[PDB]
Symmetry: C3
């Protein structure tokens, strides 16, 4: 339970992409868990017009020493050329959870 936790946020065009990324990250012990939110609507401007499509969001939980590697890995395997890969540092968590996230991700 030594290391502080970090959150990673990213979006994917499909659920399968979100599941695949979560899987690859878990298998590499780069995260402890992922929360996948389905059917989010993403709205943005492309070519001076407002576009939207359906996506999944993911919250990834890991420790702060693994954040850069996890980001690099997501970037390497992401279906998007320009994905949102965003790091949020929580101010606190319950000790039992901090412990578990560390244990899951320790080599």
């Amino acid at each position: 339970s030594m290391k502080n936790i970090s959150l990673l946020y990213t979006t994917t065009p499909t659920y399968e992409d979100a599941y695949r990324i979560s899987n690859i990250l878990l298998e590499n012990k780069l995260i402890a868990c992922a929360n996948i939110f389905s059917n989010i609507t993403s709205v943005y401007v492309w070519e001076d017009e407002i576009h939207n499509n359906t996506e999944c969001a993911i919250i990834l939980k890991t420790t702060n020493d693994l954040v850069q590697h996890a980001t690099n890995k997501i970037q390497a395997i992401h279906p998007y050329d320009t994905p949102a890969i965003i790091t949020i540092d929580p101010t606190n968590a319950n000790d039992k959870f901090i412990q578990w996230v560390n244990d899951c991700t320790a080599l």
Copy 2:
């Protein structure tokens, strides 16, 4: 509007569990509101295999002096032995809302 706000994030196995936690915290004036997200998929490893199940996520809003009390309370009533109870301190919010969160949770 004296105190700065904090967000708490947690997940539950069912919607009913999330409503219940939301409810109990509200009646104790430990939070001002809850946002419940349904049908999220959580992915993690157990016994060396990758598992997933469906959960609800919750964002809980309160003031910073109540975070520890609210976390302790969530731990005591949570269905999971090891729940994720995570605190994020926003850098800013609009005054009318900070005021409201304060008025809802102040003894």
Copy 3:
């Protein structure tokens, strides 16, 4: 990619409201994108009892120098008298996304 990105979080009574706000912010180049989460349940106290209604949540992505302007604009156009408009500052993001958020919001 000069300026750091910031996140805004808010909720709306309907999806149409969330889409409308996203739209207005985009046409003013005050955000780079919106992620809209539908059919969330919001729980709070009204009239000394615990109430709930349906909402959408939105995560808005922009640059830090636009946060105040984006918040002011949201307050002016929001259907709620007391909206939650919350700023979260990520600790890190991938360069390509920072670059894009900056390019999208430049006049």
